[PDB]
Design an enzyme around this catalytic site. Structure first.
Site, short mmCIF file in Angstrom:
data_model
loop_
_atom_site.label_atom_id
_atom_site.label_comp_id
_atom_site.label_asym_id
_atom_site.label_seq_id
_atom_site.Cartn_x
_atom_site.Cartn_y
_atom_site.Cartn_z
N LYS A 140 0.80 -1.22 0.00
CA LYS A 140 0.00 0.00 0.00
C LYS A 140 0.85 1.28 0.00
O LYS A 140 0.34 2.37 -0.28
CB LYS A 140 -0.95 0.01 1.19
N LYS A 168 -6.60 -7.35 -0.42
CA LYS A 168 -6.61 -8.54 -1.27
C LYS A 168 -5.24 -9.21 -1.32
O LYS A 168 -5.12 -10.43 -1.38
CB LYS A 168 -7.06 -8.17 -2.69
N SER A 218 6.34 -3.52 -28.22
CA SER A 218 7.23 -4.26 -27.33
C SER A 218 8.53 -4.64 -28.02
O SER A 218 9.56 -4.79 -27.37
CB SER A 218 6.53 -5.53 -26.83
N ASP A 258 2.15 -8.86 -31.03
CA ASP A 258 1.82 -8.56 -32.42
C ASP A 258 2.92 -7.68 -33.00
O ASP A 258 3.91 -7.42 -32.32
CB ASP A 258 0.46 -7.88 -32.54
N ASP A 283 3.79 -3.89 -34.63
CA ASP A 283 3.34 -2.52 -34.83
C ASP A 283 4.33 -1.79 -35.71
O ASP A 283 5.50 -1.70 -35.36
CB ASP A 283 3.21 -1.79 -33.50
O1 LIG Z 1 -4.41 1.40 -24.92
C1 LIG Z 1 -3.37 1.57 -25.59
C2 LIG Z 1 -2.84 0.52 -26.38
C3 LIG Z 1 -1.69 0.74 -27.08
N1 LIG Z 1 -1.07 1.95 -27.02
C4 LIG Z 1 0.17 2.17 -27.76
C5 LIG Z 1 1.34 1.76 -26.86
C6 LIG Z 1 1.60 0.32 -27.27
O2 LIG Z 1 2.94 -0.11 -26.96
C7 LIG Z 1 1.37 0.43 -28.78
C8 LIG Z 1 1.03 -0.93 -29.38
O3 LIG Z 1 -0.04 -1.50 -28.62
P1 LIG Z 1 -0.01 -3.09 -28.33
O4 LIG Z 1 -1.42 -3.57 -27.90
O5 LIG Z 1 0.47 -3.77 -29.54
N2 LIG Z 1 1.00 -3.40 -27.02
P2 LIG Z 1 2.65 -3.75 -27.06
O6 LIG Z 1 3.32 -3.88 -28.43
O7 LIG Z 1 3.33 -2.69 -26.24
O8 LIG Z 1 2.82 -5.13 -26.26
P3 LIG Z 1 2.54 -6.57 -26.88
O9 LIG Z 1 3.82 -7.34 -27.00
O10 LIG Z 1 1.59 -7.32 -25.97
O11 LIG Z 1 1.89 -6.42 -28.29
O12 LIG Z 1 0.22 1.31 -28.90
C9 LIG Z 1 -1.59 2.95 -26.24
O13 LIG Z 1 -1.01 4.04 -26.18
N3 LIG Z 1 -2.72 2.76 -25.54
MG LIG Z 2 2.32 -4.72 -30.03
NA NA Z 3 -0.72 3.53 -2.22
NA NA Z 4 -0.50 -3.63 -31.54
#
Ligand SMILES: O=c1ccn([C@H]2C[C@H](O)[C@@H](COP(=O)(O)NP(=O)(O)OP(=O)(O)O)O2)c(=O)[nH]1
Ligand SMILES: [Mg+2]
Ligand code: NA
Ligand code: NA
Ligand code: NA
Length: 317
Positions: A50, A62, A170, A180, A182
């Site tokens: 906390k 929790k 990521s 995925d 991007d």
């Molecule tokens: O709610 C969101 C979702 C994504 N984003 C931006 C940041 C994120 O890193 C980028 C791509 O979103 P993803 O859902 O692909 N997440 P990420 O690539 O970071 O992680 P993962 O490996 O799970 O795809 O779009 C936001 O700003 N707000």
């Molecule tokens: Mg992604």
């Molecule tokens: Na706190």
């Molecule tokens: Na994405």
DNA sequence: GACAGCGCATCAGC
DNA sequence: GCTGATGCGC
DNA sequence: GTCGG
């Protein structure tokens, strides 16, 4: 280190989002999960937890239950509830959110078998989400992300050498696996000041059979499905989600900041920006909204809101 | 009281 | 067809 | 659910 706790909070988050349709509780649990995930000690009590920002009395309580028992009664009940379970499942299909999930359950559609027999009740996105249900829950090893990057950058170069494609998400944060792909796309012909730039790239990636399906497509964002080619007699690669964003070339840094994330990192940084009297989106940073401020690097954006620069690898919250 | 900010698909109302 | 609201996901 | 005003 605190995986049991962060798993519990994530499951609660998902419950509040998918079933309760309480998005601020979802965000509250995800915030707590994130700050606990970064905490470099094995948590011994709710009191200790906390002290962290985003963990209040209820989550502290929790954590105490979970530490004492290894379980959370609230979650065990949620897991036993047929309606909650049905809704939680259906939302795992891309395109089925909390509202459509609850509607399907109302209509007696609550299993994979039910969805498969009722594809005519799904929209285009949901249909592809169901088609690749299994594949979309698999992670992508970085080795495969590298091969995918190589295909995208080279196919983009074939269309027009003036394109620049950057893989964000990521992957850019250095992750050993990604959910995925991007891709941020720029072209000198498209700026904040002044056709088919995204379309041409999508068409080329379809032509070489890399892009296999489209979830949605506009002038600046493509969301779809791709697949690595496999060799003779080999099992095929899973189909993967791919997003491509066409970004104004003079707004590359705000774009790459946004698309690199993480999502919780962006939420934290944008919230901190407001406290400092700025608003940040994927195009600009503006004072509190005035005219866009000059941006010549990612670091410039950090400087405005008085944050030390954090490398992409340190934005995984 | 406010919670980050936005693109695309889809629907209602006109 | 256009505008605005909602759902969904990034 | 948490928290700064
Ligand atoms: O709610 C969101 C979702 C994504 N984003 C931006 C940041 C994120 O890193 C980028 C791509 O979103 P993803 O859902 O692909 N997440 P990420 O690539 O970071 O992680 P993962 O490996 O799970 O795809 O779009 C936001 O700003 N707000
Ligand atoms: Mg992604
Ligand atoms: Na706190
Ligand atoms: Na994405
Ligand atoms: Na879903």
């Amino acid at each position: 280190l605190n995986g049991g706790i962060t798993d519990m909070l994530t499951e609660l988050a998902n419950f509040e989002k998918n079933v309760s349709q309480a998005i601020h509780k979802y965000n509250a649990y995800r915030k707590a999960a994130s700050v606990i995930a970064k905490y470099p000690h094995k948590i011994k009590s709710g009191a200790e937890a906390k002290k962290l920002p985003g963990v209040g009395t209820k989550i502290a309580e929790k954590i105490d239950e979970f530490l004492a028992t290894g379980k959370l009664r609230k979650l065990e009940k949620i897991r036993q509830d047929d309606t909650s379970s049905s809704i939680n499942f259906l939302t795992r299909v891309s395109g089925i959110g909390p509202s459509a999930a609850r509607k399907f359950v109302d209509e007696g559609i609550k299993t994979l078998e039910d969805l498969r027999k009722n594809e005519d009740k799904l929209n285009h996105h949901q249909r592809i989400g169901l088609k690749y249900f299994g594949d979309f829950e698999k992670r992508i090893p970085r080795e495969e992300m590298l091969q995918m990057q190589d295909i995208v950058l080279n196919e983009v170069k074939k269309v027009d050498s003036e394109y620049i494609a950057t893989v964000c998400g990521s992957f850019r944060r250095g992750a050993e696996s990604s959910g995925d792909m991007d891709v941020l796309l720029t072209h000198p012909s498209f700026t904040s000041e002044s056709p088919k730039l995204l379309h041409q790239v999508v068409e080329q990636l379809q032509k070489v059979h890399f892009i296999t399906d489209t979830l949605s497509k506009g002038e600046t964002k493509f969301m779809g499905v791709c697949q690595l080619p496999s060799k003779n007699d080999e099992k095929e690669y899973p189909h993967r989600r791919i997003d491509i964003r066409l970004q104004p070339k003079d707004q590359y840094y705000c774009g790459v900041l946004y698309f690199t994330g993480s999502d919780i990192f962006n939420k934290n940084m944008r919230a901190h920006a407001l406290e400092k009297g700025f608003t940040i989106n994927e195009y600009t940073i503006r004072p509190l909204a005035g005219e866009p401020l000059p941006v010549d690097s990612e670091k410039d954006i950090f400087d405005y809101i008085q944050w030390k620069y954090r490398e992409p690898k340190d934005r995984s919250e």
